[PDB]
Design a binder for this molecule. Sequence first.
Ligand SMILES: Nc1ncnc2c1ncn2[C@@H]1O[C@H](COP(=O)(O)OP(=O)(O)O)[C@@H](O)[C@H]1O
Lengths: 99, 70, 30, 40, 480, 378, 52
Amino acid sequence: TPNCRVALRNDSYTLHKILPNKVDPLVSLMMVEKVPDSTYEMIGGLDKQIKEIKEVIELPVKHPELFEALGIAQPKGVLLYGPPGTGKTLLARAVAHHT
Amino acid sequence: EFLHAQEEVKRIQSIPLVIGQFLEAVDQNTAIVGSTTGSNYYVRILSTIDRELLKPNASVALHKHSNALV
Amino acid sequence: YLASLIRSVVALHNLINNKIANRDAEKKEG
Amino acid sequence: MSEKKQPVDEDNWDDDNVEDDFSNQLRAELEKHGYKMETS
Amino acid sequence: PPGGGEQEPPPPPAPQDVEMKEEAATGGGSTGEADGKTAAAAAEHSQRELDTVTLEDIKEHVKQLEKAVSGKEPRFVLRALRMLPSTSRRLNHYVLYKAVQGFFTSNNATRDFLLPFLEEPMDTEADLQFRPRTGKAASTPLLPEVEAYLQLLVVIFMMNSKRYKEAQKISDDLMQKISTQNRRALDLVAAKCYYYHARVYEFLDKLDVVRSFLHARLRTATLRHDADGQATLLNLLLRNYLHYSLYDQAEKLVSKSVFPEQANNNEWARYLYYTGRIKAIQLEYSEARRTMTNALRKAPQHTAVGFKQTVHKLLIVVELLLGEIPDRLQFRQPSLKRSLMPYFLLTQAVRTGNLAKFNQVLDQFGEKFQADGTYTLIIRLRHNVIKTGVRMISLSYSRISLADIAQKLQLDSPEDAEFIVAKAIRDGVIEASINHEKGYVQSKEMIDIYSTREPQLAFHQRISFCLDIHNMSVKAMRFP
Amino acid sequence: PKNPDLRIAQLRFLLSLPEHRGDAAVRDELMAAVRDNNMAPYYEALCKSLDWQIDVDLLNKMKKANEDELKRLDEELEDAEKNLGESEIRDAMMAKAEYLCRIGDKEGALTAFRKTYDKTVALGHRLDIVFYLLRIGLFYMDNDLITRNTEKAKSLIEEGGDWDRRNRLKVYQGLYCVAIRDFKQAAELFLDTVSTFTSYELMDYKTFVTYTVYVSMIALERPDLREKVIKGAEILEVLHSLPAVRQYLFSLYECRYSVFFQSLAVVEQEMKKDWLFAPHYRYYVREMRIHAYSQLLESYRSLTLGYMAEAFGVGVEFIDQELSRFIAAGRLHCKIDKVNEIVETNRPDSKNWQYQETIKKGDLLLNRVQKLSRVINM
Amino acid sequence: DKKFHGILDQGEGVLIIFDEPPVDKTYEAALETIQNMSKVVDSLYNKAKKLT
Ligand SMILES: Nc1ncnc2c1ncn2[C@@H]1O[C@H](COP(=O)(O)OP(=O)(O)O)[C@@H](O)[C@H]1O
């Protein structure tokens, strides 16, 4: 594969053996930042915002055909707002986790 | 006879000895270390070391010229 | 008496470790 | 297989030991105590 | 004819389906690989013959209208079975008699027609030198005649069929029995027909001139072959010698035939039981219980095992005679539970100290014990009841009057209440003294049994035993 | 639902086993059997009942309503997959299979619970499914299936704290270790009685107090009863409403030995008619008698046997035959004399009795491995 | 209450006092191994008895 380690002899620099799988750089990126991995089961009292955020994100992945039946462009961007400490990060982390 | 050859193998554990650090192992009895000269190596091991004293991030001895696990 | 009791169980676990390598190769290899 | 040449033809153990002791001895030993007070 | 012609026509061919695959594969193998090259110590045809006894035990039940087995006999008996080019027509003859059942009607063998079904080893160049065929070509009709046993003017048809097999049995005993396993594979055919040779005779006939013939059968056994001829000819020697009073028990002590050293895991298992009762019936208690236990844990995994309903009863008869008792209903079954309740109520009386509690059992279930044939050992438990009780009382009470123990054991007499205690000390149950002038029996309190040698004797039996099973785990491991 | 479901299993015990008491129990269960859509668990109970000859329309009005809830599941499973949530077919009947767990037997439950086990990525629904599998495995006494999911329960609690799923769980082994005759575990699983909540199965907290005190007087000696259940304000005030059990516990503690047997006769009678102690009620008192005997007997050495009649329990010969069978049982370390009318004690060391239990287990494990090595390798 | 250990006499009130830490470490800490090893032979059924 491209971007994969190998072993290598040193007298002639002949390829020796595949050395496994090191890391994706995207995997290391989130490993640095350490977002608090969440789920719907730790959401306290936001039932209507969960129904809003599914319509824009959850539906145009599992059912992309369902907008062609209505013939509109599928949405792309979501703005979340409110005072801090009310669950903006965990709700966005939940939706990406469950689909 | 096996106990006589058991102790004979440690003549490679002589005095000009350099220091690496354990990183991982591909399989049984072959590992991957990183020397303190910056370059990493894919090395063979020596059989008599208890394998279950390895990898938190272990300090290891390496051979001078051949640069294998010691 | 405890230490000899352990000696019988350990080699019995070794006995199944040869019955795992006897029956599971005669159909595979032949 | 299963030949057997025929020449002729917890939940269980602790209570069996308890069945052995009071097998015929004071099963409903409840009301003799009401009668042992005036006697003894 | 509609109730016939839809329920009767599938019983011929679907047994013909499975009988072209089980004994035709045995006839295809055990003529060419028992008379042929070899069937070694690791053979398959014996276990294949073990597969063709058990399946036909519960296969046939009906009197065979529509010739579904009554037409198998005019099929399976017109067999030369000499070599492959003369049996290539016989491989058609496995199918040529199928339309004889179907297009026409055969001869329905209903209790009369077995006489023209036995005289065939002359017909079309049949032989008896190929007794891996003919001993099986005896047993392929000799089993289903006697499997149902049907006991209504049939016995002579079973007899003359055995007589032709007895003619094969004399050619077995005399003529070329070496390295073809002519004795070995027919020692089973000897052994398996003996149980059909017996339940005829245990039903209506005698028993004892076969025994001298069995001595003549034991004569040539271990005299040409020392494998499965020493084994099955001695349980079948014992099987009514125990039930008879003939000498036959101190003979089997000094007999060399005790060890055949291998007897195929199921006849060896009961072998230690028939001689396990011999030591039980002639008062050898402590030696018997280890060959009773060893006769239990070598038996296979069947459920309707009515002889195992007897060994679990008998194994702790002799342990009531020795004092030890396990939980007998530890593997209690829907078929074991009814076979334990009179006998489990017996050992309820043994763990107690009451005396005529034994009498309250032996009148309630005195008839049941004679059905199982065990009463003569039951009658002597009163020696073991009273030694259980005198150990029970002496350990509880320290200084008890001898004129109190008799009233608790309902002995009705203090004047021999001294005397059991005399035989309790003569046997060695309790140690301490009796003030015969006063009347109390004092007992000394026990002392430091921990600092005595005797718990090492609880160890040394088991130190050496546990090193053996570690050695047996080594000796049985490295077969690869 | 499975929340009122344990009282059914008590009333099935209340139906069959008291043989004369089988009239009001077959009425008030049928008051709940042929309502709330129960179909399966009472056919053989009806066989243990009377005829009840016309139950056919009584079944047909209910198996229809069983199908009605089952067909609206059959009308849900295509509208949930068209515009999907988090697999809302399964997610609907992950709450409606517990209905089908109550209504049908375990098979509709077990194929739907192991379905929806792989749905939820968080244990907060998974570990609540496991509590359902534990509870039906008590009804059908699935003693081999509870051993699987209890470890599968406990393997979930370590991530997170889950104390409403741990302290809830401790009651289940606490009822299971008292279902089996394992009392030193049952008092240890009932150690808290603080976080133990007003649950569904012991709907009175005070009935839970009776169960945790009846096992506590067996498992532990008296350096610990004199600190834990005499000084706990959480345990004193809840039996402060109980006249009997307060007296039943304290009579052993206050050394009021004569009135100890009086209330013990009440409890042992009550323990017979109670469910889940009736397998072992005759095991209880014979351990509580020998616990009561040795406490008095290990204070003195030269006690006469007729002192125990008027101060411990009446009947001199009743004391005589009862102590005679317990020294002969190999316990209760003393040695009764007869014709000078005195009971002498001894003190044996903690070697031989500690040696005696070792030779039991050494025979038993050697019984296990000798029998094993014969079965394997032919 | 085991805060003190001894014996009391009833005839004349004689308190025979004795003491020994008997042994606890040697046997019961070797006894629990046996029931650990019993569960190992039980777990041998899940890779041998089911398997071969
Ligand atoms: N509605 C909520 N339910 C549960 N936890 C919440 C909620 N809102 C905030 N939290 C807590 O807040 C933390 C997440 O911070 P968050 O509120 O997402 O920051 P932001 O201000 O970006 O929304 C989590 O640790 C979580 O425990």
